């Protein structure tokens, strides 16, 4: 169940909001963690083809460049059961951590896609930190882009859960983590989304992406 290639493992990923240094007191929208357990191992790109970019540099081309073991699909059920966004003065962020056996400089590109078309991209570079015999990489508290903050505002205030799911059917994120020096794909993660019911927290299911 690890999002791990031969060269890189994403151990943790969370997106959250909190009061601007009012905390502990955060709310997680989505969360993958070693701290948090979770429970069909592959999905073919044909199932998600139109939900991601597919031109030069697109998902299919990236997959064909490989390596095949670097490509994953994560389905998230996002927990929007919070009122912090309505109070204002909130901080919205994303934190991730990775590990490798190798010392690398990595670049994480995150593309937000609407109906399969990129609308915003964030690029972050991180450096290896040796700890207890392996290399750790952290992207800590990266602020969510304004597009996504506004999207969450508008989404959480629709009148029906099913409408939230409809909006989310054509909202995706494509994360590509590359080795900065070689441009090798270390990890490529396609994210698709639904909302959690009010009585449930965030959930996820992880798949390997394949292409028959």
């Amino acid at each position: 169940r690890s999002i791990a290639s031969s060269k890189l493992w994403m151990l943790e990923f969370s997106a959250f909001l909190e009061r601007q240094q009012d905390p502990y007191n955060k709310h997680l929208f989505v969360h993958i963690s070693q701290s948090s357990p979770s429970y069909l191992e592959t999905v073919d790109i044909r199932q998600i083809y139109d939900k991601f970019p597919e031109k030069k540099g697109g998902l299919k081309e990236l997959f064909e460049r490989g390596p095949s073991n670097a490509f994953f699909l994560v389905k998230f059920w996002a927990d929007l059961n919070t009122n912090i966004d309505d109070e204002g003065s909130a901080f919205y962020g994303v934190s991730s951590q990775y590990e490798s056996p190798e010392n690398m400089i990595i670049t994480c590109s995150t593309k937000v896609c609407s109906f399969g078309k990129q609308v915003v991209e964030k690029v972050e570079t991180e450096y290896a930190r040796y700890e207890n015999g392996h290399y750790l990489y952290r992207i800590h508290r990266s602020p969510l882009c304004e597009y996504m903050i506004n999207f969450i505002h508008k989404l959480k205030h629709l009148p029906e859960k099913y409408m939230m799911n409809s909006v989310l059917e054509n909202f995706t994120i494509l994360q590509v983590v590359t080795n900065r020096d070689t441009q090798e794909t270390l990890l490529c993660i396609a994210y698709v989304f639904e909302v959690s019911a009010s009585e449930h927290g965030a959930q996820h299911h992880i798949y390997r992406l394949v292409k028959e």
Binding site: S114, F115, V119, Y147, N150, F151, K154, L158, P159, M163, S166, V167, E169, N170, F171
Partner: peptide, 20 residues
């Protein structure tokens, strides 16, 4: 824009929600 996304996804329903 976020508004354009919502209008594409929800059709006339979003037009009604946004207006009123």
């Amino acid at each position: 824009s976020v508004e354009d996304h919502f209008a594409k996804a929800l059709g006339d329903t979003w037009l009604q929600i946004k207006a009123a």
